Amino acid sequence: FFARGIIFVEGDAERFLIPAFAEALDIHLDILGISVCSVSGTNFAPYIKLVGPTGLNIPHVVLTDLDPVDDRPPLARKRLLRLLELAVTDEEWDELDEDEPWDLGEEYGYFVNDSTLEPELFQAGLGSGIRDVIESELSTSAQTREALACWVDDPTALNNERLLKLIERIGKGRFAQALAGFATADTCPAYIRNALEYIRDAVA
Amino acid sequence: FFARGIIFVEGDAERFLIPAFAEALDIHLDILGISVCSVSGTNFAPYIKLVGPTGLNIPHVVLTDLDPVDDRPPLARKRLLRLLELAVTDEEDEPWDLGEEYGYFVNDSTLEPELFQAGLGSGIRDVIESELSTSAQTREALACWVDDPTALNNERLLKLIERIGKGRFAQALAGFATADTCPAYIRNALEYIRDAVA
Amino acid sequence: FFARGIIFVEGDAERFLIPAFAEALDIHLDILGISVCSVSGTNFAPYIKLVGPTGLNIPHVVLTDLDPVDDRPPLARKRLLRLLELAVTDEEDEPWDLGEEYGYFVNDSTLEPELFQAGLGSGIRDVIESELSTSAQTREALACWVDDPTALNNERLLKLIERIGKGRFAQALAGFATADTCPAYIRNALEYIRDAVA
Amino acid sequence: FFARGIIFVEGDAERFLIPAFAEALDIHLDILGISVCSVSGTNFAPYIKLVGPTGLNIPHVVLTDLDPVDDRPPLARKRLLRLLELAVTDEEWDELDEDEPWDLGEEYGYFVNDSTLEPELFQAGLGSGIRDVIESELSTSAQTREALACWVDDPTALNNERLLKLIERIGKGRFAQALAGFATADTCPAYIRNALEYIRDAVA
Ligand SMILES: [Mg+2]
Ligand SMILES: [Mg+2]
Ligand SMILES: [Mg+2]
Ligand SMILES: [Mg+2]
Ligand SMILES: [Mg+2]
Ligand SMILES: [Mg+2]
Ligand SMILES: [Mg+2]
Ligand SMILES: [Mg+2]
Ligand SMILES: [Mg+2]
Ligand SMILES: [Mg+2]
Ligand SMILES: [Mg+2]
Ligand SMILES: [Mg+2]
């Protein structure tokens, strides 16, 4: 490392896609010395310590999935309180029932989506490209292709878990490398765009 | 397991500078799926075998330094012939333009004089003066080099650069990358590998 | 997340040669949990802050080159003072022996002349002659350097080594590592970090 | 890479332990230019192609777990036939009902243990050190400590899956880094020693 800035992401899907969207947005990560570091999981806290104010004091952002669970809080709320514990001033406000630490997280460069990466891509308008990739990569049934056509016509009808099943057949990392070809500024999910603008400005 | 194209480079400086110049030229390596691969030396031949026609037939380019030698042919001559032997059709001051046809690009000296000739001399001086503690003498040497790039003393520049580390130096210098300071041989290799992947 | 000790080195050559010399001295870095960490340059100070008393207080050593300069103090002087400032108790041609007390080891020139002085000259010549295409003149230069290490021409050795790549060169040279060709400053740093981890 | 030789292993446990046993055995991997490469899984076939006779032709070995399953063949038998397909001359013998491809695998540098790494370490005589590490790292019950004392007195009584549960509480990679301190030539499992001698000789 010893980048001028770091984008911490969960996996290799993000590692392919984030630099592709940055290119689409004309945000120059290589000129600015910004690196994308996958933690191969959801445990950013060891990296935050090493890199945060106590450590090397390197500008950084975190991109992570909300991971909503049925009849339970989103997995990301607790994972975000842990990162905030290592980075926030010792005032300890309510954070809106401490289940709304999101806004304070964004001030510190921690960005959470509304579900998980691949449904967010579909909802951000990449549905046609995701369908192209899945039908080029997999051997598919007519039932699958028609489910994908329907989701493209109405992304609100999208079944997230059947989508990820399809993608896990491809491999999330291989899927994302193929989807990177389709990145445009208008199909970048908001949380990725926010994080790229944040880290560009932190470094500059 | 696969990339749409590969840019082969010699070392850490190109690893950091080629992606910066690609951004300054608006060439989207990550969207095109083009990666930059350093061979940490000057022997590209094993890699060209893996990914060339012999093997995976992945589109690729090579960036290498001429390495001109006093009273000898420059070192890149035999280096290119060796790569051409493994890539070309049936048929030295000869192989340069044929090499470029196959994505093999040689500069006219070595990376760092080329950057000075291309207009990055002010950036190189800024990087060196802000990262190192320097004597007035080296700072005046750098001022001469900027106002006349032909005056460049390469033993001295490289010693300065090795104090920083070639990769650290290049990462700092990337922040000054622009389209008008991109050496021709890098710009041509980048346009070539973008055309190729298309 | 943690190692029992760290050996900080400047670059790729030490990355490959320090573990080879440790094997030739029967110092078991993997059993002791000691890792070798290259800083890719000459600025050790940020790392010493992370792992020194200021931070994790992991036992560590530093291997760095003197970098002697004509009509100046050698570059390592200020470099060591900067690291000593961050490591030492309250109180230049001074700081060397105090530096060694804290695991900071400086050679007398730079790695590669030191290897020649220590007896590895025949290996360096073998590596260079078998990996490069060479002129008779460079092969006679290497023969002079082997029979008299004081005659060594460092501009020329380094140019040869950069044709190979410093890390490739050092990995090939590792195969010749022995206890009797290990420079003193490497041997002392290795014994020091083994004592420290115990 | 571009090592003179490669030891392909499954995970980071092996990545810590193999070089420790090599030191204990006075097999000089750094002098010989031999590297230990974790594939973070059990899928060596992509690496074998890149590195084998068709690829860079680099001397290499594979260390992998038998992975015995109850009422089923060992998982390693099929995983080994796949690697052998990419490396063996096209004679295609019986391999002893093709469920005994082990001997031919060892000729090609593919070494399989009898269960999985951590029980094999216990059985090779490291049981006392494994007990030390577990009781230093974990908070343990008296029931656990007495089960470990019993296994140390008679490794044949060892319960493999309770051992790995204990170790998975520590983290297999962190466990192995701590166990490396205990490596000796006499506690090296045979399959690791065989592989180290093979790759040392292939390189020399
Ligand atoms: Mg880019
Ligand atoms: Mg996730
Ligand atoms: Mg648009
Ligand atoms: Mg642009
Ligand atoms: Mg060069
Ligand atoms: Mg260079
Ligand atoms: Mg020994
Ligand atoms: Mg040096
Ligand atoms: Mg050196
Ligand atoms: Mg060793
Ligand atoms: Mg296993
Ligand atoms: Mg013994």
Side-chain angles (χ1 to χ4, degrees), chain B residues 101-139:
Chain B
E101 264 196 312
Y102 280 82
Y104 297 157
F105 295 91
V106 183
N107 56 43
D108 308 312
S109 70
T110 191
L111 173 61
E112 287 88 2
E114 219 83 347
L115 303 166
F116 252 100
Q117 285 170 37
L120 263 173
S122 324
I124 287 147
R125 164 191 207 172
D126 297 346
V127 169
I128 292 182
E129 293 186 7
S130 34
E131 293 225 358
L132 295 180
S133 147
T134 48
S135 79
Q137 169 199 42
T138 82
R139 293 195 304 282

Short mmCIF file of all heavy atoms in Angstrom, two decimals, chain B residues 101-139:
data_model
loop_
_atom_site.label_atom_id
_atom_site.label_comp_id
_atom_site.label_asym_id
_atom_site.label_seq_id
_atom_site.Cartn_x
_atom_site.Cartn_y
_atom_site.Cartn_z
N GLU B 101 4.11 -2.56 -34.97
CA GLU B 101 2.97 -3.22 -35.59
C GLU B 101 2.41 -4.31 -34.68
O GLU B 101 1.19 -4.54 -34.68
CB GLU B 101 3.35 -3.83 -36.94
CG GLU B 101 3.03 -2.97 -38.13
CD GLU B 101 3.06 -3.77 -39.42
OE1 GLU B 101 4.04 -4.51 -39.61
OE2 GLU B 101 2.11 -3.66 -40.22
N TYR B 102 3.27 -4.98 -33.92
CA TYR B 102 2.83 -6.05 -33.03
C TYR B 102 2.64 -5.59 -31.59
O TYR B 102 2.52 -6.44 -30.69
CB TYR B 102 3.83 -7.21 -33.09
CG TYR B 102 3.63 -8.09 -34.30
CD1 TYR B 102 4.15 -7.73 -35.53
CD2 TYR B 102 2.88 -9.25 -34.21
CE1 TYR B 102 3.96 -8.51 -36.63
CE2 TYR B 102 2.68 -10.04 -35.32
CZ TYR B 102 3.22 -9.66 -36.53
OH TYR B 102 3.03 -10.45 -37.65
N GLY B 103 2.56 -4.28 -31.34
CA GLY B 103 2.35 -3.79 -29.99
C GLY B 103 3.60 -3.68 -29.14
O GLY B 103 3.49 -3.63 -27.91
N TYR B 104 4.79 -3.65 -29.75
CA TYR B 104 6.04 -3.61 -29.01
C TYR B 104 6.61 -2.21 -29.17
O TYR B 104 6.97 -1.80 -30.28
CB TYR B 104 7.01 -4.68 -29.52
CG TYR B 104 6.50 -6.10 -29.33
CD1 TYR B 104 6.96 -7.14 -30.11
CD2 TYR B 104 5.54 -6.38 -28.37
CE1 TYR B 104 6.48 -8.45 -29.93
CE2 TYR B 104 5.06 -7.68 -28.18
CZ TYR B 104 5.53 -8.71 -28.96
OH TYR B 104 5.04 -9.98 -28.77
N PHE B 105 6.70 -1.47 -28.07
CA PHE B 105 7.04 -0.05 -28.13
C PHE B 105 8.28 0.24 -27.31
O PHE B 105 8.37 -0.11 -26.13
CB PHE B 105 5.86 0.79 -27.67
CG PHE B 105 4.69 0.68 -28.57
CD1 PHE B 105 3.71 -0.27 -28.34
CD2 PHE B 105 4.57 1.50 -29.68
CE1 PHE B 105 2.62 -0.39 -29.20
CE2 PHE B 105 3.48 1.39 -30.55
CZ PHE B 105 2.51 0.45 -30.30
N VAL B 106 9.25 0.86 -27.96
CA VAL B 106 10.54 1.19 -27.37
C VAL B 106 10.65 2.70 -27.34
O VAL B 106 10.26 3.37 -28.30
CB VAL B 106 11.69 0.55 -28.17
CG1 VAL B 106 13.05 0.83 -27.50
CG2 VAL B 106 11.46 -0.94 -28.31
N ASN B 107 11.14 3.24 -26.24
CA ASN B 107 11.35 4.67 -26.24
C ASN B 107 12.72 4.93 -26.86
O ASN B 107 13.30 4.07 -27.53
CB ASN B 107 11.18 5.26 -24.84
CG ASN B 107 12.09 4.62 -23.79
OD1 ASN B 107 13.27 4.38 -24.02
ND2 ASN B 107 11.53 4.37 -22.60
N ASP B 108 13.26 6.13 -26.66
CA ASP B 108 14.55 6.45 -27.27
C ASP B 108 15.69 6.48 -26.26
O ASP B 108 16.85 6.62 -26.64
CB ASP B 108 14.49 7.80 -27.97
CG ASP B 108 13.34 7.91 -28.94
OD1 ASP B 108 13.15 6.99 -29.76
OD2 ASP B 108 12.60 8.92 -28.90
N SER B 109 15.39 6.36 -24.97
CA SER B 109 16.47 6.21 -24.00
C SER B 109 16.03 5.29 -22.87
O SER B 109 16.23 4.07 -22.90
CB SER B 109 16.95 7.58 -23.51
OG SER B 109 16.02 8.28 -22.68
N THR B 110 15.39 5.89 -21.87
CA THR B 110 14.73 5.15 -20.80
C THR B 110 13.66 6.07 -20.24
O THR B 110 13.62 7.26 -20.56
CB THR B 110 15.73 4.68 -19.73
OG1 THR B 110 15.08 3.75 -18.84
CG2 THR B 110 16.28 5.84 -18.93
N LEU B 111 12.76 5.50 -19.44
CA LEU B 111 11.53 6.20 -19.07
C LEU B 111 11.79 7.64 -18.65
O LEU B 111 11.13 8.57 -19.14
CB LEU B 111 10.81 5.47 -17.94
CG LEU B 111 9.62 6.27 -17.43
CD1 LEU B 111 8.62 6.46 -18.56
CD2 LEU B 111 8.97 5.59 -16.23
N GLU B 112 12.75 7.85 -17.74
CA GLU B 112 12.80 9.12 -17.01
C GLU B 112 13.29 10.28 -17.87
O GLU B 112 12.68 11.36 -17.80
CB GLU B 112 13.61 8.95 -15.73
CG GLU B 112 12.89 8.16 -14.66
CD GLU B 112 13.10 6.65 -14.78
OE1 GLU B 112 13.87 6.20 -15.67
OE2 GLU B 112 12.51 5.91 -13.96
N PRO B 113 14.37 10.15 -18.67
CA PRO B 113 14.66 11.18 -19.69
C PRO B 113 13.50 11.47 -20.62
O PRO B 113 13.31 12.62 -21.06
CB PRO B 113 15.83 10.58 -20.47
CG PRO B 113 16.49 9.66 -19.54
CD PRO B 113 15.45 9.16 -18.57
N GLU B 114 12.75 10.43 -20.99
CA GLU B 114 11.58 10.60 -21.85
C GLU B 114 10.53 11.48 -21.19
O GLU B 114 9.94 12.35 -21.84
CB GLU B 114 10.99 9.23 -22.19
CG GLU B 114 10.49 9.13 -23.60
CD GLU B 114 11.61 8.80 -24.56
OE1 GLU B 114 12.79 8.90 -24.15
OE2 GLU B 114 11.31 8.41 -25.71
N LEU B 115 10.28 11.26 -19.89
CA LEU B 115 9.34 12.12 -19.17
C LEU B 115 9.81 13.57 -19.17
O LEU B 115 9.00 14.49 -19.35
CB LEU B 115 9.16 11.61 -17.73
CG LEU B 115 8.69 10.17 -17.54
CD1 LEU B 115 8.90 9.71 -16.10
CD2 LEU B 115 7.21 10.00 -17.95
N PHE B 116 11.11 13.80 -18.95
CA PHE B 116 11.66 15.16 -19.03
C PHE B 116 11.47 15.77 -20.40
O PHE B 116 11.01 16.91 -20.52
CB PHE B 116 13.15 15.14 -18.70
CG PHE B 116 13.47 15.73 -17.39
CD1 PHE B 116 13.71 14.92 -16.29
CD2 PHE B 116 13.54 17.10 -17.23
CE1 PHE B 116 13.99 15.48 -15.07
CE2 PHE B 116 13.82 17.66 -16.01
CZ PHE B 116 14.05 16.85 -14.94
N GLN B 117 11.85 15.04 -21.46
CA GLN B 117 11.63 15.53 -22.82
C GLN B 117 10.16 15.83 -23.08
O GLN B 117 9.83 16.74 -23.85
CB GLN B 117 12.13 14.52 -23.85
CG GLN B 117 13.64 14.43 -24.01
CD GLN B 117 14.07 13.25 -24.87
OE1 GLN B 117 13.41 12.90 -25.85
NE2 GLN B 117 15.19 12.62 -24.50
N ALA B 118 9.25 15.09 -22.45
CA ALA B 118 7.84 15.29 -22.77
C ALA B 118 7.22 16.45 -22.02
O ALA B 118 6.07 16.77 -22.29
CB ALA B 118 7.05 14.02 -22.48
N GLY B 119 7.94 17.09 -21.10
CA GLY B 119 7.40 18.24 -20.40
C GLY B 119 7.11 18.02 -18.93
O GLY B 119 6.61 18.94 -18.28
N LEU B 120 7.40 16.84 -18.39
CA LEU B 120 7.12 16.59 -16.98
C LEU B 120 8.26 17.02 -16.07
O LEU B 120 8.21 16.72 -14.87
CB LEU B 120 6.78 15.11 -16.75
CG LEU B 120 5.28 14.86 -16.72
CD1 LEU B 120 5.00 13.37 -16.66
CD2 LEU B 120 4.61 15.58 -15.56
N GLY B 121 9.24 17.76 -16.60
CA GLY B 121 10.41 18.11 -15.80
C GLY B 121 10.08 18.92 -14.56
O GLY B 121 10.68 18.72 -13.50
N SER B 122 9.12 19.85 -14.67
CA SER B 122 8.73 20.64 -13.50
C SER B 122 8.11 19.76 -12.42
O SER B 122 8.35 19.97 -11.23
CB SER B 122 7.73 21.72 -13.90
OG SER B 122 8.05 22.22 -15.17
N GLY B 123 7.30 18.79 -12.82
CA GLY B 123 6.76 17.86 -11.85
C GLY B 123 7.84 17.02 -11.20
O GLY B 123 7.85 16.84 -9.99
N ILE B 124 8.79 16.52 -12.01
CA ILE B 124 9.86 15.70 -11.45
C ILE B 124 10.65 16.49 -10.42
O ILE B 124 10.98 15.98 -9.34
CB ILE B 124 10.78 15.14 -12.56
CG1 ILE B 124 10.07 14.05 -13.35
CG2 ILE B 124 12.05 14.58 -11.96
CD1 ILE B 124 10.47 14.00 -14.80
N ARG B 125 10.95 17.76 -10.72
CA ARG B 125 11.65 18.63 -9.77
C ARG B 125 10.83 18.87 -8.51
O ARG B 125 11.35 18.80 -7.38
CB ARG B 125 11.99 19.96 -10.43
CG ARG B 125 12.36 21.04 -9.43
CD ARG B 125 12.45 22.43 -10.05
NE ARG B 125 13.37 23.25 -9.27
CZ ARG B 125 13.78 24.47 -9.61
NH1 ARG B 125 13.35 25.02 -10.74
NH2 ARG B 125 14.62 25.12 -8.83
N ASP B 126 9.54 19.18 -8.67
CA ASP B 126 8.66 19.36 -7.52
C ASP B 126 8.64 18.12 -6.64
O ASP B 126 8.75 18.20 -5.42
CB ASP B 126 7.24 19.69 -7.97
CG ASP B 126 7.17 20.99 -8.73
OD1 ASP B 126 8.15 21.76 -8.68
OD2 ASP B 126 6.11 21.25 -9.36
N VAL B 127 8.46 16.95 -7.26
CA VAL B 127 8.42 15.71 -6.49
C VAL B 127 9.72 15.53 -5.73
O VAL B 127 9.72 15.23 -4.52
CB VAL B 127 8.12 14.52 -7.42
CG1 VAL B 127 8.35 13.20 -6.70
CG2 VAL B 127 6.69 14.58 -7.96
N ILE B 128 10.84 15.71 -6.41
CA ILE B 128 12.14 15.44 -5.79
C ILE B 128 12.40 16.44 -4.68
O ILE B 128 12.82 16.06 -3.57
CB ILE B 128 13.25 15.48 -6.85
CG1 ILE B 128 13.09 14.30 -7.81
CG2 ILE B 128 14.62 15.49 -6.19
CD1 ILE B 128 14.15 14.19 -8.88
N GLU B 129 12.13 17.72 -4.93
CA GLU B 129 12.42 18.74 -3.92
C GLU B 129 11.48 18.62 -2.73
O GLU B 129 11.85 19.00 -1.62
CB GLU B 129 12.34 20.15 -4.52
CG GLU B 129 13.44 20.44 -5.54
CD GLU B 129 13.46 21.88 -6.03
OE1 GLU B 129 12.70 22.71 -5.48
OE2 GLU B 129 14.24 22.18 -6.95
N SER B 130 10.26 18.12 -2.92
CA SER B 130 9.37 18.06 -1.77
C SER B 130 9.49 16.76 -0.99
O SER B 130 9.07 16.72 0.17
CB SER B 130 7.92 18.29 -2.19
OG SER B 130 7.68 17.74 -3.46
N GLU B 131 10.06 15.72 -1.57
CA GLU B 131 10.16 14.46 -0.85
C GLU B 131 11.51 14.26 -0.21
O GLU B 131 11.60 13.63 0.85
CB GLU B 131 9.86 13.28 -1.80
CG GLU B 131 8.40 13.26 -2.28
CD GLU B 131 7.73 11.88 -2.24
OE1 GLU B 131 8.39 10.87 -1.88
OE2 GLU B 131 6.54 11.81 -2.59
N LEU B 132 12.56 14.78 -0.81
CA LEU B 132 13.90 14.62 -0.27
C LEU B 132 14.35 15.89 0.42
O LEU B 132 13.91 16.99 0.09
CB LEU B 132 14.89 14.27 -1.37
CG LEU B 132 14.62 12.92 -2.02
CD1 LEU B 132 15.66 12.69 -3.09
CD2 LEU B 132 14.65 11.84 -0.93
N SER B 133 15.26 15.73 1.36
CA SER B 133 16.16 16.81 1.73
C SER B 133 17.22 16.91 0.63
O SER B 133 17.81 15.90 0.25
CB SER B 133 16.78 16.53 3.10
OG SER B 133 18.09 17.04 3.18
N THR B 134 17.43 18.11 0.09
CA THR B 134 18.28 18.29 -1.08
C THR B 134 19.30 19.41 -0.87
O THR B 134 19.04 20.39 -0.17
CB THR B 134 17.46 18.63 -2.36
OG1 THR B 134 16.52 19.67 -2.06
CG2 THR B 134 16.70 17.39 -2.88
N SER B 135 20.46 19.24 -1.49
CA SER B 135 21.45 20.29 -1.57
C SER B 135 21.07 21.31 -2.64
O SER B 135 20.40 20.97 -3.62
CB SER B 135 22.82 19.71 -1.90
OG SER B 135 22.88 19.44 -3.29
N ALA B 136 21.50 22.55 -2.43
CA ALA B 136 21.31 23.61 -3.42
C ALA B 136 21.80 23.16 -4.79
O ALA B 136 21.20 23.47 -5.82
CB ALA B 136 22.04 24.88 -2.98
N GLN B 137 22.88 22.39 -4.80
CA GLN B 137 23.48 21.96 -6.06
C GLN B 137 22.53 21.05 -6.83
O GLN B 137 22.31 21.24 -8.03
CB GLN B 137 24.81 21.27 -5.76
CG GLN B 137 25.45 20.53 -6.89
CD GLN B 137 26.49 19.54 -6.37
OE1 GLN B 137 26.26 18.84 -5.38
NE2 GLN B 137 27.64 19.47 -7.05
N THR B 138 21.92 20.06 -6.16
CA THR B 138 20.95 19.23 -6.88
C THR B 138 19.73 20.06 -7.30
O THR B 138 19.23 19.88 -8.41
CB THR B 138 20.55 17.99 -6.07
OG1 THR B 138 19.54 18.33 -5.12
CG2 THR B 138 21.71 17.38 -5.34
N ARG B 139 19.28 21.01 -6.48
CA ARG B 139 18.17 21.88 -6.90
C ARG B 139 18.54 22.77 -8.09
O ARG B 139 17.67 23.09 -8.91
CB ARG B 139 17.69 22.74 -5.74
CG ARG B 139 17.02 21.97 -4.61
CD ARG B 139 16.23 22.89 -3.69
NE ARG B 139 17.07 23.96 -3.16
CZ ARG B 139 17.92 23.80 -2.16
NH1 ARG B 139 18.05 22.61 -1.56
NH2 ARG B 139 18.65 24.83 -1.75
#
